[PDB]
């Protein structure tokens, strides 16, 4: 019993964190096999952050300009290439702590763990979700660039995010491990703004199922709804549309609790109209949207 | 920017998690040097039950390798299984007993394998509001200081309200609990006041100031109000501990106490603090400073 925001154990990722210094800029790198991955903005100077030409800046660099430190050992950079917004620094040593890994690009609503690092050293681990506006509400200070987002599947680390930027609203933007940004963001200091954020509906429903599995039933009602009527109500509360894929994904939780998806949707509609009335669901006075249907099943059943 | 419930990096502890099987019971053990620590309920008169066991009854598995048990002893509610091999991954560690209101990270394990890490606090009623299923016994709570892991908790049981109870690494239970199936209940819980104040400072540091007011209060008047809302008494030690946060934000502790008094008597009124409609009490003043300054391990 109990429902907590749970991160994946970070050990497999801690053994990959290195410090990358280029000139005055110091950030974190991900050392996998003989390659160190890091944000390409590590090459940027003061005069070139508004409109940097990364291809131009990188051609002027040599391998010895990149200082890579793994613990108290300096790694030797023997090559460098750029792949979208990520810099790939070929090094002379393969990381002995390299785990079984994959590079995966995630979709909004998906959750992951973040190992926040500064100077190549892990300082904390927390759970995040890719917001529908492609930002993440992280906990990042200056020096955390290159910190990674991941999930673990048996013994395989799926790297899904690398931190690059903080927007003016205090939210965060970054890329997958192939350097492709999530969202319409660019690694430039030009005026950028996070779009209006919306609640991840399928995740709120999964969390209501988690509450039912944990004994909470106060929010349940005798009503059902059509998928279209639910979406018409949901859109007015800035909730993401619920698709047939979402309904299908919620199937196992619906079978386990005996509450049809559209039946739980009618509970959510009521909660949106009424609020909680001094009550909590799983120790929260707000509807939690950073637990996916897959997280709920994993935490509740195994 | 940003404030998250953050756990310590779990790597140093992952390298210590092993599976302990005794008869039909399978749970987790902590392998430090040549000793595996686990809840004694893996084997009630525990001296009588243990005397009937031999070293070969305890099957200890570290990954896909079986360790050989060469001795066994009991220390309070923890079983210490002496093994032939010292854990090469043994980090710099201490066994520390924590106080209510202190926070720590839990590495939830099943079958000796880590499945998740989460941050939690030792409630004033000595329970933890964890997330544990059957098979998680022996999962540990810890803090990291520099390169030293301070082991502070080992999971033993779930109370009927879904909250959890356990021991320090010396086998002494937190709270008035016993490791036996009998009538046990978590006592009435209270809010960790110093932690709520630290979290209000974290909100100020992050730009959230709506709850601030011009008022101040005496420590005694604040304590009279706090007692009425099932909040722990705030001591001069707590006020002193909140000193650096008070200096950083320019808001005196008793000034922040007057904000908390108004939040208690009036509510949030549709507003939130750090994305929460409730007053969060599982961040200590040290956690807030650590997160709002980026201390690494
Ligand atoms: O966001 C950025 N940084 C930060 C990243 N994460 C958390 C931060 C918390 C406080 C201060 C800065 C933070 C550090 C690197 C540079 C920068 C500065 C702003 O201009 C840009 C524009 C684009 C890009 Cl890709 C990066 C940046
Ligand atoms: O609590 C217990 N278990 C559990 C521990 N943590 C999370 C659990 C989630 C669901 C089910 C059981 C859980 C494991 C088995 C032993 C047990 C069962 C109840 O009787 C007692 C009495 C005392 C002690 Cl020390 C342990 C137990
Ligand atoms: Cl995805
Ligand atoms: Cl302090």
From Swiss-Prot, chain B:
Gene name, Swiss-Prot/TrEMBL: rep
Source organism superkingdom: Viruses
Effect noted on mutating residue 197 to V: In strain: Zeta/P.2
Whole-protein residues included: 3264 to 3568 of 7096
Signal peptide residue numbers: none
Catalytic activity: TSAVLQ-|-SGFRK-NH2 and SGVTFQ-|-GKFKK the two peptides corresponding to the two self-cleavage sites of the SARS 3C-like proteinase are the two most reactive peptide substrates. The enzyme exhibits a strong preference for substrates containing Gln at P1 position and Leu at P2 position
Role noted for this protein: Cleaves the C-terminus of replicase polyprotein at 11 sites. Recognizes substrates containing the core sequence [ILMVF]-Q-|-[SGACN]. Cleaves and inactivates human TRMT1, preventing tRNA guanine(26)-dimethylation of tRNAs. May cleave human NLRP1 in lung epithelial cells, thereby activating the NLRP1 inflammasome pathway. May cleave human GSDMD, triggering alternative GSDME-mediated epithelial cell death upon activation of the NLRP1 inflammasome, which may enhance the release interleukins 1B, 6, 16 and 18. Also able to bind an ADP-ribose-1''-phosphate (ADRP).
Regulation: Inhibited by pyridone-containing alpha-ketoamides compounds 13a and 13b. In turn, alpha-ketoamide 13b (tert-butyl (1-((S)-1-(((S)-4-(benzylamino)-3,4-dioxo-1-((S)-2-oxopyrrolidin-3-yl)butan-2-yl)amino)-3-cyclopropyl-1-oxopropan-2-yl)-2-oxo-1,2-dihydropyridin-3-yl)carbamate) inhibits SARS-CoV-2 replication in human lung cells. Inhibited ex vivo by michael acceptor inhibitor N3. Inhibited ex vivo by compound 11a and 11b.
Listed result of changing residue 137 to A: Complete loss of 3C-like proteinase nsp5 cleavage
Protein name (record): 3C-like proteinase nsp5
Species, as recorded: Severe acute respiratory syndrome coronavirus 2 (2019-nCoV)
Effect the entry attributes to changing residue 134 to A: Does not affect ability to cleave and inactivate human TRMT1
Glycyl lysine isopeptide (Lys-Gly) (interchain with G-Cter in ubiquitin) cross-link, renumbered residues: 5, 82
Subcellular location: Host cytoplasm; Host Golgi apparatus; Host nucleus
Active site: 41 (for 3cl-pro activity), 137 (nucleophile)
Domain Peptidase C30 residue range list: 1-297
Cytoplasmic topology ranges: 1-297
Subunit details: 3CL-PRO exists as monomer and homodimer. Only the homodimer shows catalytic activity. Interacts with host FBXO22; this interaction promotes the proteasomal degradation of nsp5.
């Amino acid at each position: 019993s109990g429902f907590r925001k749970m991160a994946f154990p970070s050990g497999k990722v801690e053994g990959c964190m290195v410090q990358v210094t280029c000139g005055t800029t110091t950030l974190n790198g991900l050392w996998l096999d003989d390659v160190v991955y890091c944000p390409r903005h590590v090459i940027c100077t003061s005069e070139d952050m508004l409109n940097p030409n990364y291809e131009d800046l990188l051609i002027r660099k040599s391998n010895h300009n990149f200082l890579v430190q793994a613990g108290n050992v300096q790694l030797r950079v023997i090559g460098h290439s750029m792949q979208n917004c990520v810099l790939k620094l070929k090094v002379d040593t393969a990381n002995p702590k390299t785990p079984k890994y994959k590079f995966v690009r995630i979709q909004p609503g998906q959750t992951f763990s973040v190992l926040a690092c500064y100077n190549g050293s892990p300082s904390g681990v927390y759970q995040c979700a890719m917001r529908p506006n492609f930002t993440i509400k992280g906990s990042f200070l200056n020096g955390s660039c290159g910190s990674v987002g991941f999930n673990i599947d048996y013994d395989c680390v799926s790297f899904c995010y690398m931190h690059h930027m903080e927007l003016p609203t205090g939210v965060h933007a970054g890329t997958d491990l192939e350097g492709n940004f999530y969202g319409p963001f660019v690694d430039r200091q030009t005026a950028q703004a996070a779009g209006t954020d919306t609640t991840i509906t399928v995740n709120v429903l999964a969390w209501l199922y988690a509450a039912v599995i944990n004994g909470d039933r106060w929010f349940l009602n005798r009503f059902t709804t059509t998928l279209n009527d639910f979406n018409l109500v949901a859109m007015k509360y800035n909730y993401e549309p619920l698709t047939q894929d979402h309904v299908d994904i919620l199937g196992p939780l619906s079978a386990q609790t005996g509450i049809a998806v559209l039946d739980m949707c009618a509970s959510l509609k009521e909660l949106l109209q009424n609020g909680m009335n001094g009550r909590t669901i799983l120790g929260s006075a707000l509807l939690e949207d950073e637990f996916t249907p897959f997280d709920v099943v994993r935490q509740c059943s195994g």
